[PDB]
Design an enzyme around this catalytic site. Structure first.
Site, PDB file in Angstrom:
ATOM      1  N   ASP B   6      35.505  37.517  35.840  1.00 46.86           N
ATOM      2  CA  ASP B   6      34.670  38.440  36.632  1.00 46.86           C
ATOM      3  C   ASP B   6      35.599  39.465  37.302  1.00 46.86           C
ATOM      4  OD1 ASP B   6      31.800  38.879  37.878  1.00 46.86           O
ATOM      5  OD2 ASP B   6      33.140  38.982  39.608  1.00 46.86           O
ATOM      6  N   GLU B   8      36.052  42.569  39.874  1.00 49.27           N
ATOM      7  CA  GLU B   8      35.588  43.499  40.912  1.00 49.27           C
ATOM      8  C   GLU B   8      36.580  44.673  40.931  1.00 49.27           C
ATOM      9  OE1 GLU B   8      32.682  42.973  42.567  1.00 49.27           O
ATOM     10  OE2 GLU B   8      32.454  41.028  41.558  1.00 49.27           O
ATOM     11  N   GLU B  55      32.047  51.590  48.412  1.00 46.53           N
ATOM     12  CA  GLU B  55      31.188  50.459  47.961  1.00 46.53           C
ATOM     13  C   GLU B  55      31.992  49.174  47.711  1.00 46.53           C
ATOM     14  OE1 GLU B  55      29.834  49.195  44.113  1.00 46.53           O
ATOM     15  OE2 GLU B  55      27.798  49.888  44.542  1.00 46.53           O
ATOM     16  N   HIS B  60      33.893  42.841  48.971  1.00 43.05           N
ATOM     17  CA  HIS B  60      34.719  41.712  49.404  1.00 43.05           C
ATOM     18  C   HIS B  60      36.047  42.092  50.131  1.00 43.05           C
ATOM     19  CE1 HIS B  60      37.342  42.122  45.806  1.00 43.05           C
ATOM     20  NE2 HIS B  60      36.232  42.495  45.205  1.00 43.05           N
ATOM     21  N   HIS B 156      38.332  36.450  48.102  1.00 41.17           N
ATOM     22  CA  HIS B 156      37.432  37.586  47.951  1.00 41.17           C
ATOM     23  C   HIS B 156      37.884  38.341  46.719  1.00 41.17           C
ATOM     24  CE1 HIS B 156      35.774  36.553  51.782  1.00 41.17           C
ATOM     25  NE2 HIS B 156      35.004  37.625  51.821  1.00 41.17           N
ATOM     26  N   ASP B 161      34.802  34.697  42.161  1.00 39.16           N
ATOM     27  CA  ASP B 161      33.614  34.787  41.350  1.00 39.16           C
ATOM     28  C   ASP B 161      33.826  34.004  40.073  1.00 39.16           C
ATOM     29  OD1 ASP B 161      32.053  36.437  43.118  1.00 39.16           O
ATOM     30  OD2 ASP B 161      33.127  38.204  42.434  1.00 39.16           O
TER      31      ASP B 161
END
Lengths: 145, 218, 73, 217
Positions: B6, B8, B55, B60, B156, B161
């Site tokens: 995952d 980010e 954003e 996180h 984070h 994730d």
């Protein structure tokens, strides 16, 4: 033209004729209605009322052949009333231009009568008419407001 | 052999190419063999080449200045490629991550083809959508659904994730298996009678006279 | 002889509403593109497309064929 | 969408196949080249099936006119309806006489086209219906089509507008020099449908009366 700011013509400065006055009286020489189109064919060029309605119909469809024939009937109809040919045809061009927007007077009138009724009531006894209006659209909070 | 990721990122584009003008900041993936963590986690941080988006920051938290000295995608291109090549790629919202990945791959200009050509990318959201139709199937939604906390965990970003998704993934694709199991020959042919044929003729006459054609009589 | 060895006798238009998809005129034009001389429509518990079928049948010289499908108990 | 389910729902019935498309004649001929009777029986059945429904052309109805023509009943009620309106509009009888010719000429010119086109029963039904719903508390909608151009409609209390006052023309609404239908498309307030259904059932029969469906698309 209603308030004297421009010369009234029946319908145009050059292309007008006083025999159109009874037809165009209500609208100060402005071609507004479908019914005026029909009255012009009757008065100017000797159409039957039913043949006049057939001209208005043919102006809605805008076909190539179709106009060509009525364009001729409208010429000899004006001739038969002693009216000038070039004038008759130049007015026909204007009729046909404005026939695109030309509105149904009888349909407009049936509804406009209802507007006048709502107007008169509200002016004479809005003390009830308003109550009625509220009651009708009680469901809508926005309208009620 | 099963590969979980995952990613980010430095925020996203809302419209059009979510990857255009944007870059990857952290790669955090866990490797899964026989539905277990070996513990060989690949957790790396790379070069932003740009600012982290407001954003992404709120998602996180993460500072741009932290990813400045860290290497670019070019320095770990082969490293990451061999780590995932010819394996199972399970992603949440695969269009997002894959889009970024292949984007960065093309930017390297190294003849490296898109990852989807040598690896099977499978979306978990599609599966979740099939199982739970019209339900929120976000990561955090499934997290709360199976009573997993991903909010009060120190990690984070990616590694967080990845770990969580692995547990969820295995749970959904375990869950309890099921047993379950799941021409010739004579025959009459009613032929239209002469009276019916007369009705037929009359009916075709109508078709033809009114329409100007009848393919039955052509 | 002419063409016909076969015509389709159970077909739904979108007017069945439980099923069907194509509108009535497009269904008729496909039948004709297939070189078929007539056409049965058997819509679900209705004749909603019948009026339109007959208007399109007349226009194309195609014979409309009468049918509809139902459930029994 | 009809059933209320989504494609991949396990509960969804799966009774249908990709073969259910418009196969050609030849495609069906090969599918069943083992049962030729089955194809041929379609052709046979189709030729036995011959229904004539004539479309686009009317059927007329009526009104208790005694042993009188419906035509003549209309002539009577229209002359006498004209008399009401004239005494309302011009309650001075001297004025009514001077203003009158225009109306009488309009009246008989319309009357000629209505009767020669075979309309009179229809207009009688409608005018009575419109009157009764005014007597009782039944709101009538604003719409009149182009019906405001009929002075006869007005005379008969079918309409509310004086067409001679406002140069409104009947021939937009019914044209004699063109087969023009009875599109007249009259409306009333939908709230009071039950009261009207009731009157027109008492009149013509509950089985001869029905509502018309619209559509969800």
């Amino acid at each position: 033209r209603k308030h004297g700011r421009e010369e009234i013509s029946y319908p145009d400065v050059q292309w007008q004729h006083e025999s159109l006055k009874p037809v165009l009286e209500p609208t100060y020489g402005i071609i507004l209605y479908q019914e005026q189109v029909m009255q012009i064919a009757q008065v100017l060029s000797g159409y039957t009322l039913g043949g006049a309605d057939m001209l208005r119909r043919a102006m809605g469809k805008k076909k190539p052949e179709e106009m060509a024939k009525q364009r001729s009937v409208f010429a000899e109809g004006a001739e038969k009333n002693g009216i000038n040919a070039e004038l008759a045809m130049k007015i026909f061009d204007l009729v046909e231009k404005f026939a695109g927007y030309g509105f149904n007077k009888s349909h407009s009138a049936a509804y406009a009568l209802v507007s006048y009724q709502t107007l008169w009531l509200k002016a004479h006894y809005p003390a009830e008419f308003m109550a009625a209006v509220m009651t009708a659209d009680m469901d809508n909070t926005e309208k009620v407001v | 052999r099963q590969i979980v990721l995952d990613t980010e990122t430095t925020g996203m584009n809302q419209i059009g190419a979510h990857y255009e003008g944007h870059k990857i900041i952290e790669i955090g993936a866990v490797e899964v063999v026989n539905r277990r963590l070996t513990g060989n986690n690949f957790h790396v941080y790379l070069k932003p080449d740009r600012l982290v988006d407001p954003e992404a920051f709120g998602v996180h938290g993460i500072a741009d200045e932290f990813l400045l000295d860290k290497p670019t995608f070019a320095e770990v291109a082969d490293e990451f490629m061999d780590y995932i090549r010819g394996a199972e790629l399970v992603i949440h919202n695969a269009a997002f991550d894959i889009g970024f990945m292949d984007y960065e791959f093309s930017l390297l200009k190294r003849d490296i083809p898109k990852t989807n050509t040598f690896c099977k990318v499978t979306d978990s959201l599609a599966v979740a959508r099939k199982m739970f139709p019209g339900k929120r199937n976000s990561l955090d939604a499934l997290c709360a659904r199976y009573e997993i906390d991903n909010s009060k965990r120190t990690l984070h970003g990616a590694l967080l994730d990845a770990q969580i998704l692995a547990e969820v993934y295995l749970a959904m694709t375990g869950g309890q298996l099921s047993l379950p199991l799941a021409q010739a020959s004579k025959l009459r042919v009613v032929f239209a009678t002469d009276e019916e044929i007369a009705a037929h003729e009359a009916r075709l006459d109508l078709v033809q006279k009114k329409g100007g054609s009848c393919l039955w009589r052509a | 002889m002419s063409e016909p060895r076969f015509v389709h006798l159970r077909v739904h238009s979108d007017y069945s509403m439980i099923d069907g998809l194509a509108k009535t005129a497009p269904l008729v034009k496909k039948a004709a593109a297939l070189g078929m001389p007539a056409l049965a429509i058997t819509d679900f518990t209705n004749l909603c497309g019948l009026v339109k079928f007959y208007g399109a049948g007349h226009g194309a010289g195609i014979k409309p064929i009468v049918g509809a499908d139902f459930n029994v108990q | 969408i009809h059933d209320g389910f989504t494609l991949d729902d396990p509960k969804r019935p799966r009774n249908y196949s990709p073969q259910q498309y418009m196969r050609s004649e030849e495609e069906m001929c090969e599918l069943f080249a083992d049962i030729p009777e089955a194809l041929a029986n379609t052709v046979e059945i189709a030729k036995r099936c011959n229904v004539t429904v004539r479309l686009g052309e009317y059927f007329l109805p009526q009104f208790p006119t005694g042993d009188m023509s419906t035509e003549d009943y209309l002539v009577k009620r229209a002359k006498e309806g004209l008399e009401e309106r004239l005494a309302f509009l011009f309650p001075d009888e001297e004025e009514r006489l001077k203003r009158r010719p225009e109306y009488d000429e309009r009246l008989e010119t319309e009357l000629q086209v209505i009767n020669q086109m075979g309309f009179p029963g229809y207009f009688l039904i409608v005018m009575e219906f419109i009157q009764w719903s005014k007597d009782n508390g039944v709101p009538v909608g604003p719409g009149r089509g182009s019906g405001a151009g009929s002075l006869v409609a007005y005379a008969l209390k079918i309409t509310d507008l004086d067409p001679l006052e406002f140069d409104l023309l009947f021939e937009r609404f019914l044209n004699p020099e063109r087969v023009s239908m009875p599109d007249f498309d009259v409306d009333f307030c939908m709230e009071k449908r039950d009261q009207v259904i009731e009157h027109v059932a008492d009149m013509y029969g509950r089985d001869a009366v029905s509502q018309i469906i619209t559509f969800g698309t």
